[PDB]
């Protein structure tokens, strides 16, 4: 009957576990942001646990899709655009961002959603989730922990979630820089062509077009070299991620989440070989063939153990790509 104003009060008379679950299922049907805020106000006025409710709403929406991690064949599947079901999973994060006290849980749940989107190669949907998390969230989580007068280190879950969020940031930044570089390298200035019987006026017009092309090519190359340096730095920040490597927990004093641990290992096996192939492609196309070969030293390094995340097929393909770069060095 759409009597929204009355629901929070009658739900407060239920047992706490039933109140949380029943109110969460109600809030899942609310799409309008002004109504969302009004329902949280009413839940707070009724003395309901708003924090457990908004957490449960996000978990229910996250659990609605038991889509198995599709075994991806080696096709460059074009960026599968954000679906309406993906949009519902993005917009559920707003529930946890409303209360600053929930920033730790907002970060944990956003990481869990981004893990699914990254495994499905939905990079734009993962960026939309990342942009819902306010940039101060890490500082706010530390501030709230310090205010609770705990001389103890942060909970190992929240420290691992902060680290995971930083891993996802480094990956998204490297993919964005690569896409900017990839758009720029495919847009070179066109060399002016002389028609084979040009008049004196057309020869002078060609000389002016040729001088303009030399200038425009100089600028295009200078921007390409800058973008190449930026993409190289960003991909190295992923491959050489500090203190135990990318998508690896540093704190072992957490409860065992086997699903999260499995997802992190899977993402390492998908993302790190890809980033190494993208970096080889950047360095090879920019004629940095000596730095292509240093990728063998980085992948074989005992410090990061990156060779453990490669399949035998991907390792063979990497060595074949490195050989293509060595052949260009012999031609030099």
């Amino acid at each position: 009957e759409k009597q929204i104003e009355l629901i929070a009060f009658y739900v407060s008379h239920l047992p706490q576990e039933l109140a949380i679950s029943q109110y969460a299922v109600f809030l899942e049907n609310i799409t309008d942001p002004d109504q969302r805020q009004r329902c949280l106000e009413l839940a707070k006025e009724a003395g309901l646990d708003v924090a457990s409710i908004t957490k449960t709403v996000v978990e229910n929406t996250r659990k609605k899709d038991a889509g198995e991690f599709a075994h991806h064949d080696f096709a460059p599947a074009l960026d599968s655009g954000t679906s309406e079901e993906d949009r519902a999973k993005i917009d559920v994060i707003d529930w946890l961002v409303f209360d600053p006290a929930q920033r730790a849980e907002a970060l944990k749940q956003s990481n869990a959603i981004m893990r699914k989107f990254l495994a499905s190669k939905k990079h734009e949907a993962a960026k939309e989730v990342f942009a819902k998390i306010p940039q101060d969230s890490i500082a706010e989580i530390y501030s709230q922990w310090e205010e609770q007068a705990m001389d103890s280190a942060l909970p190992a879950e929240d420290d691992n979630a902060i680290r995971e969020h930083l891993c996802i940031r480094a990956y998204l930044e490297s993919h964005e820089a690569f896409n900017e570089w990839f758009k720029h390298i495919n847009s070179p200035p066109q060399k002016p062509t002389l028609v084979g019987q040009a008049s004196f006026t057309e020869k002078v017009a060609h000389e002016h077009k040729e001088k303009k092309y030399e200038m425009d090519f100089g600028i295009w190359k200078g921007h390409l070299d800058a973008l190449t340096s930026d993409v190289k730095e960003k991909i190295y920040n992923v491959l050489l991620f500090v203190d135990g490597g990318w998508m690896v927990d540093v704190r072992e004093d957490t409860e065992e989440d086997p699903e999260r641990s499995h997802q992190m290992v899977l993402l390492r096996r998908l993302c790190l070989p890809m980033m190494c192939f993208l970096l080889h492609t950047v360095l090879h196309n920019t004629k940095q063939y000596k730095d292509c070969l240093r990728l063998a030293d980085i992948v074989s390094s005992e410090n990061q153990k990156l060779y453990t995340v490669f399949s035998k097929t991907e390792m063979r393909n990497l060595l074949q790509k490195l050989r293509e770069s060595s052949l260009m060095l012999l031609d030099l």
Binding site: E1, E5, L6
Partner: protein, 56 residues
Amino acid sequence: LDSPSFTEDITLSAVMLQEEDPGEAATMSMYPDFLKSFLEHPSSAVFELIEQYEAT
């Protein structure tokens, strides 16, 4: 200032005559009034609350 008892009743009766079921709408209109009456009365005034439900 000054005098409600005949014009408001005619307007509300005329509005409910435009509803597809005036009996269901009368029932629906009382849901907020019952909750409001419950919230206005402390747990010590339970009989004043029932008198307010009777009046509603």
